[PDB]
From a paper:
Of these are a class of multi-protein ABC toxin complexes (Tcs) that have multiple receptor binding domains on the shell of the A subunit (TcA) for recognizing and binding target cells. The Xenorhabdus nematophilus TcA, XptA2, has thus far only displayed toxicity to insects. Here we report the high-resolution structure of the Xenorhabdus nematophilus TcA XptA2 by X-ray crystallography and cryo-EM, each at 3.1 Å resolution. XptA2 forms a 17.5-nm-wide, 24-nm-long pentamer with a molecular mass of ~1.4 megadaltons (MDa).
To generate a structure in the absence of crystal packing, we next solved the pre-pore structure of XptA2 using single particle cryo-EM, which yielded a map at 3.1 Å resolution. The cryo-EM and X-ray structures exhibit 5-fold internal symmetry comprising five protomers that assemble as a pentamer. XptA2 shares the conserved α-helical translocation channel that is less than 1 nm in diameter, housed within a balloon-shaped outer shell. The remaining β-sheets are composed of three IgG-like receptor binding domains (RBDs) that may play a role in cell surface receptor recognition and targeting. Both structures reveal that the RBDs are like sockets in grooves with only modest contact with the main XptA2 shell. The central translocation channel is formed by five extended α-helices per protomer for 25 α-helices.
Numbering used by the authors:
A (entry chain B): 294 to 586
B (entry chain A): 1807 to 2002
C (entry chain A): 50 to 293
D (entry chain C): 2198 to 2246
E (entry chain A): 880 to 1074
F (entry chain B): 929 to 1025
G (entry chain B), H (entry chain C): 2100 to 2148
The structure:
Amino acid sequence: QKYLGMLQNGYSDSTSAYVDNISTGLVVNNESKLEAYKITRVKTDDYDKNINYFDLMYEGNNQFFIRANFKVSREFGATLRKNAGPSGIVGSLSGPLIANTNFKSNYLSNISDSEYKNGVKIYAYRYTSSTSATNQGGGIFTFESYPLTIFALKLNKAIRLCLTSGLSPNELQTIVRSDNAQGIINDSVLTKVFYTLFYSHRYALSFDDAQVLNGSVINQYADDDSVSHFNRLFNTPPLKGKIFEADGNTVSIDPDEEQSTFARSALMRGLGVNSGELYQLGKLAGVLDAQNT
Amino acid sequence: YYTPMMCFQRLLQEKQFDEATQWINYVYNPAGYIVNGEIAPWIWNCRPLEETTSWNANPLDAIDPDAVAQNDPMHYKIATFMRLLDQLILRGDMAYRELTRDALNEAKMWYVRTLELLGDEPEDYGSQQWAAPSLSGAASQTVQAAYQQDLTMLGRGGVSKNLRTANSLVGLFLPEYNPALTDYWQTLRLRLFNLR
Amino acid sequence: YHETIEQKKNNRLLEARIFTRANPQLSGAIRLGIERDSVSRSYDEMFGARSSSFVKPGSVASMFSPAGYLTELYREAKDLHFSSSAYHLDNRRPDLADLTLSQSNMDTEISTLTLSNELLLEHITRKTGGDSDALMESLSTYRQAIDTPYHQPYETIRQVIMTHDSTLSALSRNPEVMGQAEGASLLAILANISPELYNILTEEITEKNADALFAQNFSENITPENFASQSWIAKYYGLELSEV
Amino acid sequence: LSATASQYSADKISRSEAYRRRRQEWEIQRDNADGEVKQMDAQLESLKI
Amino acid sequence: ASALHTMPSVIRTLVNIRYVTALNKAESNLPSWDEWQTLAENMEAGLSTQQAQTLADYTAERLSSVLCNWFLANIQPEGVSLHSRDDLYSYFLIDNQVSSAIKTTRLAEAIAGIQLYINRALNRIEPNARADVSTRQFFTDWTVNNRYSTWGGVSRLVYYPENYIDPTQRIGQTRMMDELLENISQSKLSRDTVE
Amino acid sequence: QQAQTLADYTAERLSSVLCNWFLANIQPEGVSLHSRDDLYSYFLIDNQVSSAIKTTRLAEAIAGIQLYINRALNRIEPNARADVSTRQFFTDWTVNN
Amino acid sequence: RIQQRTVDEVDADIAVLAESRRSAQNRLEKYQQLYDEDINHGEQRAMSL
Amino acid sequence: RIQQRTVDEVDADIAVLAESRRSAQNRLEKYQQLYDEDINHGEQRAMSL
């Protein structure tokens, strides 16, 4: 289940569908081909409060949402994708949204096949009053689909590599994602795996830290009983809220700025540096932008 | 049934394993019973167990495990089987604690026999298909009454009009495995790992 | 009543009888002396694969789990009071009815103080109609209680400073920066004094504004004659009689 | 006669249980001696270092 | 700045907070609420994980006390008079006076709350309890249903009686079976002795 | 010493590889065997043991025949000749085992 | 070289302490098992007789 | 010369440890023989009587 998630075989109506992945074989209905897909979720801020589950379901060329709630509310919800942007609406859940009840969402539309790979399908802009709405949580959803034989071959590759090297399925997935979009295994990926093992043995680092050292991004996948590396760095414990990469906006790391930002403070605390050292790191890495942002 | 079982239990407590085996073979023997120079066709040598004869019609009038097993003498079959497994595991541990090569081989033999009598242990089946309900949804008197009416009708008849029960209307809890048997399997796994 | 009790007992016996034979752990050299009953087949054909959905002990789905115990407790104690009474379970705790019986709820560790704080916060914001942040801002200036005013950012700053440098040794050894601080501000560092508590402590009291100050500093249901009883003062300020 | 038989049976069972507890205390003493021997075997390695 | 694990701008901001009695003199200079929040975030950014957890525990305890006092002073339920933290405990079925160190789970705390409520209702401590409801089989067997362990034992006895079968004792054992047990209750049992 | 350690590691790896190859490519006349434990019960010798435990050929043959006899007497392997399983040697199996 | 041997000596002392603690823990489990069992079935039978 | 005497002293300590281990091993053998023998023929005869 670490590799495959939960197979869709007609369970009960709610039952969730993520362990924290979902997959099944589905015969495409526009022609006579049988494919297999897989959707992986990274939970997004304020998900453990409200939302029993928030699942992205795939039906062959179009996707919808299945949602359950912790608390009862008498109003509706809008599933957005942007930070309350004009073009952020991608679907709606019609209420009243009672707790512990399944709710389907109307064949989400405003999302492209390009962003369906590493694209946030989620924004639970749920209405608590007639004019008050809040972000009640969600997750970033990544979708892959292959013919069944190609899926089996890729699973063969991944399982053999994980078994022989000792890396976790999610660690290998992050390594291959930080190397190419197609998630193929080549000399570059094998070299990164070697350097991961070597750095872990040499500097007495965890596999996540060695993976970051090798050139990969910080891992955000959680295993439904553990904490992701990003969350362990930046949200254990949270300052007062959750800092997430699902922000995409510009924060100024100029030390000389009056009225600093919560994002800057959380980044400083996660990296274990002060404002001047964070400015030094920004200059050294060259991630700096205009206005020292 | 009750006298050979008590004699077996006392001999096992005193560690007279061969005599205990002789006394428990009057009730159950995995190798059968020799009657008139041939293997008998019955599995259990205790006739009331072989025929599952209930002789207690009011078992729940008091908290009494023996009364329950008298109402359903299947539990007596399970109890005798578990007593036999306990005897085998005690024999294996007693052989193991001698540390000689022949003693270790004897321990391996006893553990393998216990494993072959137990079989292959099952997995968790219904946990991930369970839809977690609300507290009020689980305590729903309507759900409880529907299940109880189905049970009452099943206790006499078997009418299954609209056979499938429309799984979406389940807020009931699921049966649980036996911790004693899982403990047997865990012990055997640990002992075989250490021996190997 | 007696027939209802006997039927309940019979159904319990039948369910146990079915599950005993359906158990996969007896599959099994003991399975040779096991027979499938017609009632077992009927139960299977009615309820699907329920009879074979055995779960491992420690799962929330089990019938002997804490979820099952809580279901029984709630089912029987739901009606211990009339829905009119304020002591009704669903009147004093409306979240119990909507509590979800899931494995994460059964296993995940959390602090009793966190749960109690979220319950109290829910009740307070239900009463006031505002947000948690609005409640905190209001508490920062609320005076008509003994544990208030509660300036949460101020207390966080004070605790951070006390963690980093207790006894103010670093500040004492650097007189250039210690001289720029006011005495009352340093008192706020050394002891819990919010800006509003400082205003309370340093506001001047005259006979003209005595009544307005009393109305501002005390609840509406408190009159200056309430200070003629020492037991009331002890109860209000949370002191013992000797302390008063 | 029933009372006398009960008294004899009780005496027999009491003596048997006394013997059992005495064997348990002997087992504890045996374990203590074995632990002492092992501890001395380790002290020997310390002393030769 | 190094001692407080922060920067001289933050130190200057902390120093600029002056208590000057807010009149009776020129004036006092205090930050706004949002400026206080920004200063708190900046100051808390310098702590490690352990110190952050300790600070969170202290904040939880202080908020518990403040919220309990606010509730006691401002909210009175329908027909319930509650005058203390212990009254709040017995009303909301959760202890607000516990430390931040002790932990639990949601289901365990719900179980404890309902157990406390049932005890208070049955022992006539809370008025108007429905006496007809208090005579059910659950509350009649409340001597074993008041704890999860005893409830689980009496519930499992129906489904796995073989775990509690004892070959040497049983309700309804005959006198001759007792005599046989006494006859073989020694420690050195031979085959001839058992026969 | 290092050569002996290398030989032990090689023996363990070869045992696993050969067992997997046998399972995936060879099936006997009418026996369905699906595991290393099935291979153990069939070939009457443990392939899951370590290289540390040692034995002799006669001792291993004795253990294998004892395992086979236990499996045949307890009706675990089907089609066992019940007339043969009533001899004196197997009637006294409580002391001959 | 001599100082390295001294380090080895303190390691050997740690090993001795490990053996001592193993013996003490065995005693603890033995006496806890005696205490929890209390009056066994034979003694209870004799008293009832 | 003095350092040679120190070496002789630690040898004497090794000999003391040897005597201590001899006593411990004697105790272990005695208690093992008592434990394995358990209930002897005289006690068994008395209980049967």
